[PDB]
Amino acid sequence: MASMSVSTASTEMSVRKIAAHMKSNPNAKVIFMVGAGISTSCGIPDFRSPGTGLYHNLARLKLPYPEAVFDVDFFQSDPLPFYTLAKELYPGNFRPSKFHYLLKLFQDKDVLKRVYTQNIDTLERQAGVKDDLIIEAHGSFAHCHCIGCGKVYPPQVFKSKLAEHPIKDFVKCDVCGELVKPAIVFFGEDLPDSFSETWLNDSEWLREKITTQQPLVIVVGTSLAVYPFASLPEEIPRKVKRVLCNLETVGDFKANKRPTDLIVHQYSDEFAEQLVEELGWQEDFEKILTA
């Protein structure tokens, strides 16, 4: 849970600007858009990184390249690599980070409009963020369905297969016989309707607040390299302040910077620490963290 700054440079002044904006607009809410960066401190292994036990197990299993684990065609031809990744990444194996708890604090303070996440770890929900405020753009393991006929299956059927040694006899649909898989969006598949639908509604909400207070969209720990999720930032209203907390400037913040863009090069957990400080909520935060 302990963090430190990424470099000798201080980001407290930049983080202070954010707290100042929220101070001047006490009845405004914030929309977060997050990626893998906010869960790195949780110890979740990056399947694309050698030196991770997961990477080598997938390589030993003949996975051709990391992302084939999230490819429909590959899964149907050989589901073992995905099952192996699921065993290691299944929700419940990790604990939320300081940044995940920040989302909870904001909710408690009624300043959370929505959190759009590309992650499948569901640590936002595990941390106590309400279902209504979360948009898991790439799905999660909480639901399962047959890839052929769409029949619904309880998530526990899939989960029970992961505890077997070795993992074999994968879940097959008792209607059409095809493989059943967790509701995780694989490369090549459309995201769930709720993604576009909610962004449609939040986009109007954003544009309408510009004319009344002022909202704020904060992008954290994402390389903005996966679409359509990566299109959100450019679609934020020109008149709505965009904030980016990432080790490096990426996506629209790099391709089309905006005068009002606030860029903060900092670890998501350190950022959380500094924001809570500048907001004066250290007391409530500590309570949540110790709860």
């Binding site: 090549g188 459309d190 993604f195 996966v226 679409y227």
Partner: peptide, 7 residues
């Protein structure tokens, strides 16, 4: 909607 998940 935006299309299918991709790079």
């Amino acid at each position: 909607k935006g299309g299918a998940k991709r790079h």
